[PDB]
Amino acid sequence: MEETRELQSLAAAVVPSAQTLKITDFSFSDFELSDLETALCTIRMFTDLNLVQNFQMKHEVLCRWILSVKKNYRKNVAYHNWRHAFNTAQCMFAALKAGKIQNKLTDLEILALLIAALSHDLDHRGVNNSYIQRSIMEHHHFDQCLMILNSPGNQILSGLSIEEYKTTLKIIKQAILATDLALYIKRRGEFFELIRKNQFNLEDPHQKELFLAMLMTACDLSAITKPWPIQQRIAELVATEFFDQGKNKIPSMQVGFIDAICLQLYEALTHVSEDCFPLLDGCRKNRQKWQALAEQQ
Ligand SMILES: CCCOc1ccc(S(=O)(=O)N2CCN(C)CC2)cc1-c1nc(CC)cc(=O)[nH]1
Ligand SMILES: [Mg+2]
Ligand SMILES: [Zn+2]
Numbered sequence: 001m002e003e004t005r006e007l008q009s010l011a012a013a014v015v016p017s018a019q020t021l022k023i024t025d026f027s028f029s030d031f032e033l034s035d036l037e038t039a040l041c042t043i044r045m046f047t048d049l050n051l052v053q054n055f056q057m058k059h060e061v062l063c064r065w066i067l068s069v070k071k072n073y074r075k076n077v078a079y080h081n082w083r084h085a086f087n088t089a090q091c092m093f094a095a096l097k098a099g100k101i102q103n104k105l106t107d108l109e110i111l112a113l114l115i116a117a118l119s120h121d122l123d124h125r126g127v128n129n130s131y132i133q134r135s136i137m138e139h140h141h142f143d144q145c146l147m148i149l150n151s152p153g154n155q156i157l158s159g160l161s162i163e164e165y166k167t168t169l170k171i172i173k174q175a176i177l178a179t180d181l182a183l184y185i186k187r188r189g190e191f192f193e194l195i196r197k198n199q200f201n202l203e204d205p206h207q208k209e210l211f212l213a214m215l216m217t218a219c220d221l222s223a224i225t226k227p228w229p230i231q232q233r234i235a236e237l238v239a240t241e242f243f244d245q246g247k248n249k250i251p252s253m254q255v256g257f258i259d260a261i262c263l264q265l266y267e268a269l270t271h272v273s274e275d276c277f278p279l280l281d282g283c284r285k286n287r288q289k290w291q292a293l294a295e296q297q
Pocket of ligand 1: 181224234235236238239242250253254256257260261
């Protein structure tokens with residue numbers, strides 16, 4: 001099988017440093033990377049967050065798990081595919097390291113966030129696809145996540161005690177549920193209102209959970225923070241999924257997306273951690289770019 005070959009190659013490969021793979025950079029891009037290379041980057045993410053160590057992950061199991069996750073995204077979907085999931089996780093890794101968020105979280109929270117980031121859009125069929133089995137989409141994504149986590153040879157949480165496991169699974173679930181933008185809109189007010197008054201405190205369980213939710217959305221949307229040539233390309237992908245699947249209004253829509261959803265979030269995040277500023281800076285630069293295009297109609 002192509003996949004048995006794929007596992008062997010992945011399992012046998014040496015994993016380059018985080019620095020070599022550029023995964024610490026907020027401006028990271030995956031366009032030039034093969035599927036195998038994104039798999040290596042993902043291993044390095046688990047490794048340098050001390051997750052392989054602290055939770056006793058077997059190499060071939062983590063490899064198998066990454067390949068299962070990748071396989072359960074749909075290639076024919078223009079934007080919501082493995083590369084979007086991979087990028088979300090990279091942004092999580094970057095925010096944890098470069099953004100210095102790692103120190104504010106527990107190991108179990110970090111484990112959950114990385115798994116959630118990678119898993120949060122599993123089996124997405126594209127924005128214009130919706131079926132009736134009756135945050136519905138997000139429950140399906142989590143279901144896929146759980147299914148892969150319980151599959152033979154893919155159990156990367158096997159090293160956790162049952163108590164750690166249940167705690168981790170619940171964090172993973174809330175984190176994936178949080179990627180529902182309706183949910184983010186409903187909850188962000190509290191977050192912003194809290195930051196506004198310097199009342200925001202991570203030691204409070206309820207606020208911790210709120211922050212994990214906000215962090216998920218920030219990574220999820222982080223293409224909007226990329227260098228202009230990259231953002232332009234990603235916008236092209238989402239435009240294809242939005243309209244093609246299955247006056248140019250796009251620049252105006254992007255400005256509206258940035259204003260309504262993106263700016264305040266990245267603003268809020270930089271307050272929590274000044275080192276996350278490149279996300280806010282990048283988002284502001286893209287607004288300027290899209291706005292100018294919008295002004296030319
Ligand atoms: C680039 C072509 C247009 O893209 C958009 C148009 C409108 C809006 S929106 O804020 O008004 N709105 C629409 C209804 N919802 C689903 C919630 C959001 C968002 C985007 C957009 N989304 C993403 C994330 C998938 C990335 C991105 O770059 N742009
Ligand atoms: Mg989603
Ligand atoms: Zn997403």
